[PDB]
Design an enzyme around this catalytic site. Structure first.
Site, PDB file in Angstrom:
ATOM      1  N   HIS A 126       0.704  -1.095  -0.046  1.00  0.00           N
ATOM      2  CA  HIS A 126      -0.103   0.052  -0.114  1.00  0.00           C
ATOM      3  C   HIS A 126       0.892   1.474   0.001  1.00  0.00           C
ATOM      4  O   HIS A 126       1.777   1.365   1.001  1.00  0.00           O
ATOM      5  CB  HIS A 126      -0.908  -0.015   1.285  1.00  0.00           C
ATOM      6  CG  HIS A 126      -1.948   0.893   0.991  1.00  0.00           C
ATOM      7  ND1 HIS A 126      -2.042   2.377   1.065  1.00  0.00           N
ATOM      8  CD2 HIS A 126      -3.369   0.715   0.708  1.00  0.00           C
ATOM      9  CE1 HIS A 126      -3.119   2.949   0.907  1.00  0.00           C
ATOM     10  NE2 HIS A 126      -4.053   1.786   0.627  1.00  0.00           N
ATOM     11  N   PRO A 127       0.587   2.198  -0.922  1.00  0.00           N
ATOM     12  CA  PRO A 127       1.587   3.355  -1.370  1.00  0.00           C
ATOM     13  C   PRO A 127       1.036   4.518  -0.444  1.00  0.00           C
ATOM     14  O   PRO A 127       1.421   5.765  -0.761  1.00  0.00           O
ATOM     15  CB  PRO A 127       1.128   3.739  -2.634  1.00  0.00           C
ATOM     16  CG  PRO A 127      -0.150   3.204  -2.834  1.00  0.00           C
ATOM     17  CD  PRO A 127      -0.503   2.068  -2.001  1.00  0.00           C
ATOM     18  N   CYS A 128       0.184   4.371   0.757  1.00  0.00           N
ATOM     19  CA  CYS A 128      -0.110   5.390   1.645  1.00  0.00           C
ATOM     20  C   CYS A 128       0.805   6.419   2.112  1.00  0.00           C
ATOM     21  O   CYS A 128       0.556   7.723   2.137  1.00  0.00           O
ATOM     22  CB  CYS A 128      -0.972   4.946   2.822  1.00  0.00           C
ATOM     23  SG  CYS A 128      -1.642   6.073   3.776  1.00  0.00           S
ATOM     24  N   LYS A 129       2.174   5.875   2.320  1.00  0.00           N
ATOM     25  CA  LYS A 129       3.148   6.759   2.946  1.00  0.00           C
ATOM     26  C   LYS A 129       4.391   6.634   1.845  1.00  0.00           C
ATOM     27  O   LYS A 129       5.351   6.899   2.326  1.00  0.00           O
ATOM     28  CB  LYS A 129       3.538   6.305   4.140  1.00  0.00           C
ATOM     29  CG  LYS A 129       2.292   6.396   5.291  1.00  0.00           C
ATOM     30  CD  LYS A 129       2.839   6.183   6.792  1.00  0.00           C
ATOM     31  CE  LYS A 129       1.926   7.053   7.431  1.00  0.00           C
ATOM     32  NZ  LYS A 129       0.587   6.093   7.588  1.00  0.00           N
TER      33      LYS A 129
END
Length: 183
Positions: A126-129
């Site tokens: 997941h590329p959230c941060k």
């Protein structure tokens, strides 16, 4: 003009730029080819939807790594697909073994490759941060060039964005044997 060193974020046009450069400096990485199996996005060229590298060895194990473009976070997002030596698809709890524990529990999920109509199970980081990470990594690279020079134009260009991204990914997937060296 671009604020990518400031935001750690890339536009779709910049994603294509960095992808072309990645495909050039490392020809083991290739853009997707046109296919009827591919769920196309209008905001990207049909032959430049995502980036693929095949059968990167682990440990035996082998991985297909995919680099797609996250529209929500305006960053690249990675997908891994693992295989045993006999070519049999690996399992989600097997594939989790090849991901750093701390980073695994926080970012990794199981889902099909969203750019394929045909279901192919993968592990999704997941590329959230990602934007915050890249923001720090790019500036850190800049400092290295700053010290190397001292013996301003030390900041990287955006088409080099993905190499910095991959150097980040490699750290999170240590057992997967691929590395990216510049200068």
């Amino acid at each position: 003009k671009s604020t990518f060193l400031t935001t750690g974020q890339i536009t779709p046009e910049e994603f294509v730029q960095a992808g072309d450069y990645l495909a050039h400096m490392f020809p083991t990485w290739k853009w997707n080819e046109e296919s009827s199996d591919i769920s196309y996005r209008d905001f990207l060229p049909k032959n430049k939807q995502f980036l693929i590298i095949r059968k990167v060895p682990a440990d035996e194990r082998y991985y297909d790594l995919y680099i797609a473009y996250s529209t929500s976070y305006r960053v690249p997002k990675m997908y891994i697909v693992g295989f045993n030596s006999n070519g049999s698809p690996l399992s989600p709890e097997q594939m989790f073994e090849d991901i750093s524990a701390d980073y695994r529990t926080k970012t990794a999920t199981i889902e099909k490759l969203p750019f394929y109509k045909n279901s192919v199970l993968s592990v999704s980081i997941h590329p959230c941060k990602h934007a915050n990470v890249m923001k720090i990594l790019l500036d850190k690279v800049r400092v290295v060039r700053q010290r190397r020079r001292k013996e301003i134009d030390d900041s990287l260009r955006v088409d080099q964005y993905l190499i910095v991204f991959l150097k980040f990914i490699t750290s999170v997937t240590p057992s997967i044997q691929h590395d990216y060296t510049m200068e």
